Write an enzyme that holds these catalytic residues in place. Structure first.
Site, PDB file in Angstrom:
ATOM      1  N   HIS C  94       0.775  -1.225   0.000  1.00  0.00           N
ATOM      2  CA  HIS C  94       0.000   0.000   0.000  1.00  0.00           C
ATOM      3  C   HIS C  94       0.817   1.290   0.000  1.00  0.00           C
ATOM      4  O   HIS C  94       0.334   2.340  -0.371  1.00  0.00           O
ATOM      5  CB  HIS C  94      -0.892   0.005   1.262  1.00  0.00           C
ATOM      6  N   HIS C 121       0.283   8.934  -3.866  1.00  0.00           N
ATOM      7  CA  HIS C 121       1.071   7.763  -3.531  1.00  0.00           C
ATOM      8  C   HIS C 121       0.261   6.493  -3.803  1.00  0.00           C
ATOM      9  O   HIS C 121       0.841   5.478  -4.170  1.00  0.00           O
ATOM     10  CB  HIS C 121       1.690   7.864  -2.116  1.00  0.00           C
ATOM     11  N   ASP C 192      -3.637   0.421   8.566  1.00  0.00           N
ATOM     12  CA  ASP C 192      -2.542   1.333   8.257  1.00  0.00           C
ATOM     13  C   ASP C 192      -2.355   2.364   9.380  1.00  0.00           C
ATOM     14  O   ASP C 192      -1.233   2.590   9.843  1.00  0.00           O
ATOM     15  CB  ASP C 192      -2.734   2.044   6.927  1.00  0.00           C
ATOM     16  N   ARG C 233     -17.962  -3.429  18.034  1.00  0.00           N
ATOM     17  CA  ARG C 233     -18.831  -3.555  19.184  1.00  0.00           C
ATOM     18  C   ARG C 233     -19.236  -2.149  19.608  1.00  0.00           C
ATOM     19  O   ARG C 233     -18.432  -1.248  19.588  1.00  0.00           O
ATOM     20  CB  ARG C 233     -18.097  -4.322  20.273  1.00  0.00           C
TER      21      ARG C 233
HETATM   22  N1  LIG Z   1      -7.525  -1.310  27.267  1.00  0.00           N
HETATM   23  C1  LIG Z   1      -8.840  -1.060  27.376  1.00  0.00           C
HETATM   24  N2  LIG Z   1      -9.488   0.031  26.824  1.00  0.00           N
HETATM   25  C2  LIG Z   1     -10.823   0.177  26.998  1.00  0.00           C
HETATM   26  O1  LIG Z   1     -11.510   1.119  26.540  1.00  0.00           O
HETATM   27  C3  LIG Z   1     -11.493  -0.851  27.797  1.00  0.00           C
HETATM   28  N3  LIG Z   1     -12.723  -1.072  28.188  1.00  0.00           N
HETATM   29  C4  LIG Z   1     -12.757  -2.202  28.936  1.00  0.00           C
HETATM   30  N4  LIG Z   1     -11.523  -2.710  29.043  1.00  0.00           N
HETATM   31  C5  LIG Z   1     -11.076  -3.951  29.739  1.00  0.00           C
HETATM   32  C6  LIG Z   1     -11.753  -4.215  31.062  1.00  0.00           C
HETATM   33  C7  LIG Z   1     -11.791  -5.700  31.075  1.00  0.00           C
HETATM   34  O2  LIG Z   1     -10.496  -6.110  31.526  1.00  0.00           O
HETATM   35  C8  LIG Z   1     -11.957  -6.100  29.637  1.00  0.00           C
HETATM   36  C9  LIG Z   1     -13.374  -6.283  29.103  1.00  0.00           C
HETATM   37  O3  LIG Z   1     -14.092  -5.040  29.109  1.00  0.00           O
HETATM   38  P1  LIG Z   1     -15.631  -4.923  28.585  1.00  0.00           P
HETATM   39  O4  LIG Z   1     -16.150  -3.603  28.906  1.00  0.00           O
HETATM   40  S1  LIG Z   1     -15.327  -5.199  26.649  1.00  0.00           S
HETATM   41  O5  LIG Z   1     -16.356  -6.166  29.357  1.00  0.00           O
HETATM   42  P2  LIG Z   1     -17.872  -6.170  29.789  1.00  0.00           P
HETATM   43  O6  LIG Z   1     -17.997  -4.874  30.569  1.00  0.00           O
HETATM   44  O7  LIG Z   1     -18.205  -7.484  30.454  1.00  0.00           O
HETATM   45  O8  LIG Z   1     -18.676  -5.984  28.423  1.00  0.00           O
HETATM   46  P3  LIG Z   1     -19.923  -6.961  28.041  1.00  0.00           P
HETATM   47  O9  LIG Z   1     -20.526  -7.489  29.335  1.00  0.00           O
HETATM   48  O10 LIG Z   1     -20.759  -5.897  27.400  1.00  0.00           O
HETATM   49  O11 LIG Z   1     -19.453  -8.051  27.104  1.00  0.00           O
HETATM   50  O12 LIG Z   1     -11.339  -5.073  28.908  1.00  0.00           O
HETATM   51  C10 LIG Z   1     -10.727  -1.933  28.367  1.00  0.00           C
HETATM   52  N5  LIG Z   1      -9.432  -2.002  28.122  1.00  0.00           N
HETATM   53 MN   LIG Z   2       0.943   3.228   5.502  1.00  0.00          MN
END
Ligand SMILES: Nc1nc(=O)c2ncn([C@H]3C[C@H](O)[C@@H](CO[P@@](=O)(S)OP(=O)(O)OP(=O)(O)O)O3)c2[nH]1
Ligand SMILES: [Mn+2]
Ligand SMILES: Nc1nc(=O)c2ncn([C@H]3C[C@H](O)[C@@H](CO[P@@](=O)(S)OP(=O)(O)OP(=O)(O)O)O3)c2[nH]1
Ligand SMILES: Nc1nc(=O)c2ncn([C@H]3C[C@H](O)[C@@H](CO[P@@](=O)(S)OP(=O)(O)OP(=O)(O)O)O3)c2[nH]1
Ligand SMILES: Nc1nc(=O)c2ncn([C@H]3C[C@H](O)[C@@H](CO[P@@](=O)(S)OP(=O)(O)OP(=O)(O)O)O3)c2[nH]1
Ligand SMILES: [Mg+2]
Ligand SMILES: [Mg+2]
Ligand SMILES: [Mg+2]
Ligand SMILES: [Mg+2]
Ligand SMILES: [Mn+2]
Ligand SMILES: [Mn+2]
Ligand SMILES: [Mn+2]
EC number: 3.1.5.-
Lengths: 481, 477, 470, 476
Positions: C94, C121, C192, C233
């Protein structure tokens, strides 16, 4: 019913199978949240706030990564989902048996409280795991996901503690022997448990590590070795393996055996010993146990965590005053003073039973110097530390099988000379540290004189600062100068 | 005898003056080892094992770095070693007042246990600091190192909590010292800088603010007859980003829906336990969890341990509290139903009536079960840039390279048209104590109906969770 | 051919399929080793020594990670090894079309050297890719590993540049999501960006713990308007807004750093002066100029950052003007930044035409000014790219939904584009610079542009004139 | 005013205006176009970094250390002038490097000009003098309080050692300031800030882990009297960390700097340079023309000798360079000389080893017979920087109870798990014939030669030469 994702600072996003989630969400597993990975080390490295719980998730994760990678590269192994889950469960549960402040409990407290008993965290883990399964109706859940509990519980326990007893394992056959090499490798110590703690401890301690256990996993293969299928490393990775053990030794030197971390561990242990008979911990059927006997009943052990430290510290019972006072001294940072370190000389080693006599021995030395104060055996602590490559005297790399790119299915052995002449010639040693309970300047000066004299008397190594701390004594020994 | 060095994963090697070491090595300070920085967040982010203790060292460290840098660049300020130590002490002690699980205690538990009171961790910190000083004979030590305890204790407290020129600890010429640890003017302080870096390290997330750079470009200028800290003009974008980072951390982590629910459950357990746990205070007196704030000796022993004391108890009186904690362990949590926002500027005053309101909605749908006010939790979360409706950057002074002693002001338009137009909002989360599938389905219907009734924003998953209700509201679809 | 492992500081150990290795080990790809990712940025951030080559490996790697993850979670997609390889190839290739100092070449030099031509590019990458394939007998190799060159070359090009009504011929609507991975024309969310965020941060010394890995883990494919598209999601929407915020911040701090840009401008000027005197040998031994090498890929293959040093180290009198500019860069005798405001060839004249009510020792001419117009946006001009993202909820993972900005936060941007206008002065004298500031601020006032941040300091006499400014 | 530079390793580095003047010159900026790790970039794509950024880091850390010592021990009478001189030496210590760094001084020059004795250190001193004189720096030095006569001498001595039997062979500073010579390039034991920067920087770019914590070391550094000199002393407890520093260095060499393919690429580039030498012309002072191998004679020419040369050759339209160009093109296609194997001596100039391997007669059938010229033998010295010696035996330490009293610590006082030896060799063999039959033959010659010489058994010996390996009884 659905996978869960957990974000881990070391490993990023970890996917957990529903069965694993069920196991994790139990009092027996969640207990690990309340036990510090490095025990007294937190009191020297403020970064090391991490607990056994997060380490356990990481170990389960990496166990899954390795078994999965092997299966994808070598479909012929016939690795099954059932196998993968069992390996992950063992990885998750391998540290279930740890007690308050981790190694301090199994390493220091139990040996002193119950010298007759032979106990380790491994054995504890197996007992807790059984308790976890039985208390929480996990077996039905295992069946739901295709596990066979009779065989698989056996397999999991064997991964954690080794044979419960030719192939000596009952949980899997010789063709699946490599599965026993992943979580806790009794053959040479190269396992995913080390890989996680190297990375996790470094992250928290503030010691840098860009290295990859990931690399190791990528280059891992299974080959036939003496009619077993075993994990083999690529030949060129041998240097990295030596370095892994070097890293382990450095972490012990800098952090896990840090002189003050150890003294705090020692002080906590002393407090626990004084408290033992007065704390009561409720077990199965409402029965009461002591700190030192909770290991006999898992329901009691479930409730034995770092909290105990605070229960003692915050107590008002007069019977706990002696124990409480030690903990209070830790809080005021009124800790015993490090006097010095030496090593036993040539073939001579220190036997475990003889640790107790050592303070008396130091006090018994008569240093040819004027002394304002005279010190007593009870004023000294002597800490004997065994430093090795995980296999006592042995070189674990002599117990590793390798392969070459031109014949990836052919296992070979590599000796130390085929690697580097700069490697260690020995794989085990002892450190002897001496501390003084009297912290005043005059006492400390005296303690240094006794210590260096004792070193000279025993022909131990010259302390690094010997010429500075005991200028009069060091001339006496010709070898030293 | 001399300085101590502490290795911190965020800051590396931190040098501590002996006076600071004396303060640190006390039961009142060491208590912070046993209080989690992020409380219930640890139950969602396993990386977040860190405690208030390590954060406090970092704040004291950065306070020292900033005051030192200013002194080195501008000797004319007449910054003294005494000043530096006082700023460090305030930085170290600013979080002394936190209770079990941190914000949950001051944010959730105390407001419910003691609604009449206004209590904050700041007030707690001042009280604990006084207790620490008096209990451990620190004042003599302060004098030995050149501190004047009457003036300087006052100064330290004022840095932590603000006025008790309304300040008595230092004069207007040293006004900039009050901007370092806890900045009441615009919220730009070293406390934020440490937790951004530390929380990110442990959470496994990315931090937008580069605090070292900020320190390097910080200067003191005259502003309205005070000497105040001014940032270099080009750093304004970085400052906006600092607040953005704060908001993102709250959104992703501190206000994580499950972290909050666990905090809520722990709070409920504490409330049920309150009268039956007794905490021993000064003179052997007994206090409750909700009254330990009255006696610092009791408060000293109020840490996360309490959670385990309840969990491991066998007292029948504690059964209700213990059972909630046990449910947390089994991960049998209250269920998240959904999240919405109040519409535009209009905002919700302080809360107890809300669950009833949701239950009162009559969704035009088939329901197997009927739910009650008591089955709902409604959590109202205020998201802002630290100054309610205001833009804190409008309360920052800057300087240009061509005139480094001349303070200027910079408005939002002079920066970017891509910045926020608003600086405050609310999130409303609803949970259900009934966890069964039929109850949860019903809860979703009540919730979305309530949103429609109130003209709140359409929940993101509204069309999926309540397909019948969402058509009713035209705006939504 | 065999599989190879490459250690990357950002991604760790990357596995490369033998076909990918064959493509990489060619003069056309290896050329990327000699082209800086950030061009003139290296002259401000010494950490930014990285080249397009390592970035390209990372993009190919992450493309593979995403397509693989989607396939493992949703076997029903019928993703094939052939599909995976094509996506990786596009990710790797790319950036094949980039010229010396990257964006400077397509962003600054070509528009001035060849205003009539419309070049990017992207177009360059497609041409180079074709040249790479044809010059090195790659098509037979593609067949060996199951690729169908006619369809798949088309597919790869389309991923890079977009359509050459489903307008794509390389894959059908069911595989639409494959076009969203390397270069997402729908909303700009692609691998990218994920590589360069992490890589540029690593080298710039700007911290980033975050995960594109998280995003991959939560990515899914759903039906959207009779196409299969990648959906995020729902709860990740905040993270997506933050991704674009991060991009903007990197542009503000680093990519559009006022001095990095001026060095790019100076290099461009030098190239323009050198153009006719450097000759680059193309196919059949034909000779091209820096500005015409884009016409012949054999010539373009030999057009890299080295040209800069060829000019700098030259002794030809014809190159003296070009050489002198480069020498001035080395001495850090730069064109001088005058200022920045907010609302192309005519602009310098416009600034010079302003008559500032102030005494001036010198009078400046249109040719003494550079005016740099910078578009700061969320990658889609005026549009909010998040309005062009599809999401799913945990309770119905196959059901795509749309989320509007109000459903997220009232603290988000109301606008998604702006311009920055920077003015610089060639002369560099204190008196000239002072004059340039006066012309600049006057021009801002004349045009009703925003008050420069330092306007009151640099032009105290002029700023009072405009009432709004105060 | 001061300038601030953001570095990914060190963060924000403050540069004194005098340092900026030195940096903003053609002689210094040249370092932007010379790769730190040379051919290593062709194995580790992360290693794009150049000497320029490394040099800023070294100058920075030199300043950090001298500043820290001065703050802890005001009695040393360290001056701003001293600090600036140390920083300038740190900045300029790598000025003398040529294209692809060690390849130029390590491989190319020894082959192109065997008679000449040349090192990058000497180059650095010459380029530094050229930099000063060409850019009117001396007046600027005086403006900021430097004394050029003494201080230029001091700077050069820090880079190359005595320009000269004596307890003091240095003229730039006296014995009381001896510790200043231990900072940038430590001839006593090799513990310096140059290593500390490249450990951190190379690791950052390679994607590997570094054992040495240099900030800690600086914090615990002190000056004590040792044999009538004031020397830098480390705190006693840091001795383990020092051993680890050297372990890290050895690991980096093993994994990266001596990577078998990185080395072969370096060899191929060197071959290309040799073939190109007479046809590339580099313009020097007065417009005179020099060759790649003679540019070291004229600093104006040397200033223009950078990695670009590689691309000039590769992209040369000019036929004259076809053999050189073709080698570079083969590198691009990854058509490399083939690694055959690696072994170690028992024990320990250039032409002779390939001949020796070819002379071995392996007791095996061979389709092809290989010649000395078909082999490359690369002999690699792995040590702790001081040949056979343990550098830690040449370090001075102090204890907390007597911080001004220097002591010595021997290996046995530390750990019995440390190396017994501090130097070894690796011997790698490659084949210029890349076809399968040739490679198979090369393996047979190689393993036979190992057996003949009693060298160590190659790790893959049983796989590559199953027939030969039985012959040697030791090889179990
Ligand atoms: N690194 C990071 N950034 C983020 O924005 C974030 N948000 C959550 N987590 C971490 C926290 C946890 O270690 C993990 C999952 O968070 P999840 O919110 S996807 O889980 P459930 O709340 O159970 O959502 P469900 O019930 O709807 O499936 O990721 C995060 N980790
Ligand atoms: Mn690139
Ligand atoms: N990164 C790092 N590497 C190390 O090798 C190391 N060793 C300790 N620390 C951390 C732990 C501490 O947080 C800090 C200092 O540990 P220190 O051992 S110097 O302190 P005292 O025992 O008090 O030495 P003394 O009494 O002789 O002066 O750095 C370290 N941190
Ligand atoms: N991170 C890391 N540690 C290391 O020890 C190391 N060694 C190499 N690399 C990087 C360099 C490359 O970027 C990659 C693989 O190097 P490899 O040594 S596995 O490769 P070939 O020489 O082709 O081995 P063969 O031909 O014997 O199979 O990892 C490494 N990367
Ligand atoms: N890490 C980081 N974040 C940033 O946001 C940032 N911005 C710049 N730099 C790096 C790039 C440079 O290496 C260094 C200085 O950039 P500077 O923008 S302060 O310098 P001049 O523009 O010359 O400022 P003056 O307007 O006073 O002349 O910091 C940065 N580094
Ligand atoms: Mg969930
Ligand atoms: Mg100490
Ligand atoms: Mg290879
Ligand atoms: Mg500047
Ligand atoms: Mn473990
Ligand atoms: Mn705080
Ligand atoms: Mn160097």
């Amino acid at each position: 019913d659905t996978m869960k994702v957990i974000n881990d600072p070391i490993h990023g996003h970890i996917e957990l199978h529903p069965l694993l989630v069920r196991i994790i969400d139990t009092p027996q597993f969640q207990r690990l949240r309340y036990i510090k990975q490095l025990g007294g080390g937190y009191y020297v490295f403020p970064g090391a706030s991490h607990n056994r719980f997060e380490h356990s998730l990481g170990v389960g994760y990496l166990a899954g990564c390795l078994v999965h990678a092997l299966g994808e590269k070598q479909p012929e192994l016939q690795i099954s989902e059932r196998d993968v889950l069992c390996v992950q469960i063992a990885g998750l549960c391998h540290d279930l048996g740890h007690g308050p402040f981790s190694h301090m409990f199994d390493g220091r407290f139990i040996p002193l409280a119950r010298p007759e008993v032979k106990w380790t965290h491994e054995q504890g883990s197996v007992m807790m795991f059984e308790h976890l399964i039985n208390s929480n109706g996990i077996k039905p859940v295992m069946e739901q996901y295709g596990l066979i509990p009779e065989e698989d519980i056996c397999f999991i326990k064997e991964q954690i503690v080794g044979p419960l007893e030719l192939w000596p394992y009952k949980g899997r056959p010789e063709n699946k022997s490599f599965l026993y090499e992943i979580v806790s490798n009794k053959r040479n110590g190269i396992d995913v448990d080390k890989w996680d703690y190297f990375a996790r401890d470094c992250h928290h301690l503030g010691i840098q590590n860009n290295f990859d256990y990931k690399r190791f996993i990528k280059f891992a293969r299974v080959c036939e070795v003496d009619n077993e299928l075993r994990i083999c490393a690529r030949d060129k990775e041998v240097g990295n393996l030596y370095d892994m053990f070097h890293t382990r030794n450095s972490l012990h030197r800098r952090a896990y055996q840090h002189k003050v971390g150890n003294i705090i561990d020692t002080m906590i242990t002393d407090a626990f010993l004084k408290a033992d008979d007065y704390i009561e911990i409720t077990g199965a059927g409402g029965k009461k146990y002591r700190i030192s006997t909770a290991i006999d009943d898992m329901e009691a052990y479930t409730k034995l965590t770092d909290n105990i430290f605070l229960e003692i510290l915050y107590s008002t019972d007069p019977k706990l005053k002696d124990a409480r006072e030690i903990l209070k001294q830790i809080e005021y940072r009124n800790l015993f003073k490090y006097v010095g370190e030496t090593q036993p000389t040539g073939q001579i080693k220190i036997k475990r039973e003889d640790y107790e006599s050592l303070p008396k021995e130091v006090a018994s030395a008569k240093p040819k110097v004027l002394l304002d104060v005279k010190l007593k055996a009870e004023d000294f602590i002597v800490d004997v530390i065994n430093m090795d490559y995980g296999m006592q005297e042995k070189n674990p790399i002599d117990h590793v099988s390798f392969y070459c790119k031109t014949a990836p299915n052919r296992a070979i052995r590599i000796t130390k000379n085929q690697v580097s002449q700069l490697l260690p010639e020995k794989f085990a040693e002892q450190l002897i540290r001496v501390y003084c309970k009297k912290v005043d300047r005059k006492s400390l000066y005296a303690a240094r004189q006794y210590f260096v004299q004792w070193c000279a008397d025993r022909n131990f190594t010259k302390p690094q600062d010997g010429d500075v701390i005991a200028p009069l004594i060091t001339p006496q020994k010709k070898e030293w100068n």
